[PDB]
Amino acid sequence: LQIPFAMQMAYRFNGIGVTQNVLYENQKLIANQFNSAIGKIQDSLSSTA
Amino acid sequence: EGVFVSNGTHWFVTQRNFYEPQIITTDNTFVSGNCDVVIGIVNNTVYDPLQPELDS
Amino acid sequence: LQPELDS
Ligand SMILES: *[C@@H]1O[C@H](CO)[C@@H](O[C@@H]2O[C@H](CO)[C@@H](O)[C@H](O)[C@H]2NC(C)=O)[C@H](O)[C@H]1NC(C)=O
Numbered sequence: 193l194q195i196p197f198a199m200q201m202a203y204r205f206n207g208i209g210v211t212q213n214v215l216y217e218n219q220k221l222i223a224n225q226f227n228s229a230i231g232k233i234q235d236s237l238s239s240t241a
Numbered sequence: 242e243g244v245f246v247s248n249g250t251h252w253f254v255t256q257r258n259f260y261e262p263q264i265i266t267t268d269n270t271f272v273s274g275n276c277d278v279v280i281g282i283v284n285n286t287v288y289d290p291l292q293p294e295l296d297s
Numbered sequence: 298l299q300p301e302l303d304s
């Protein structure tokens with residue numbers, strides 16, 4: 193079933209007991225933390241095999 | 242507990258795993274903050290059950 | 298709410 197990704201993350205937040213408005217009110221920060229954490233994994237794999 | 246959905250002319254709350262639309266009210270929704278923060282918010286009426294009762 | 302309808 194298609195669903196917008198920001199809405200999917202708001203339900204995955206609701207599954208950990210955090211109210212879904214916490215995502216929509218912080219969506220940019222949450223996206224930057226995710227994007228930067230994917231970034232660190234390239235550096236980790238490129239350094240500590 | 243639901244999802245907001247539209248048939249192109251109206252907006253409803255419905256449950257995730259079985260389509261059953263209900264009118265948007267103060268009682269199937271909760272508030273947080275003003276409109277400016279949210280990416281992708283839309284304008285619609287939300288029904289209030291109290292005033293049309295206390296009017297009579 | 299019904300018993301509160303004094304007003
Ligand atoms: C979207 O759903 C609403 C509610 O089911 C539909 O609005 C009703 O349409 C009928 C005529 O087909 C009217 O008798 C009702 O009075 C309407 N209700 C309201 C609240 O206005 C609407 O037609 C649906 N739209 C589409 C495109 O399917």
Ligand SMILES: *[C@@H]1O[C@H](CO)[C@@H](O[C@@H]2O[C@H](CO)[C@@H](O)[C@H](O)[C@H]2NC(C)=O)[C@H](O)[C@H]1NC(C)=O
Nearest residue numbers: 275276277278279280281282283284285286287
């Ligand atoms: C949702 O409704 C509000 C009004 O209830 C709209 O706000 C107005 O937006 C225009 C264009 O930016 C401004 O000129 C007005 O001054 C705004 N009104 C107020 C009271 O600030 C809002 O634009 C609507 N949202 C959408 C996407 O149409």
Ligand SMILES: *[C@@H]1O[C@H](CO)[C@@H](O)[C@H](O)[C@H]1NC(C)=O
Nearest residue numbers: 196197198199279280281282
């Ligand atoms: C969806 O994308 C359109 C452009 O295609 C944009 O105008 C709109 O604001 C976006 N809405 C959300 C919820 O991302």
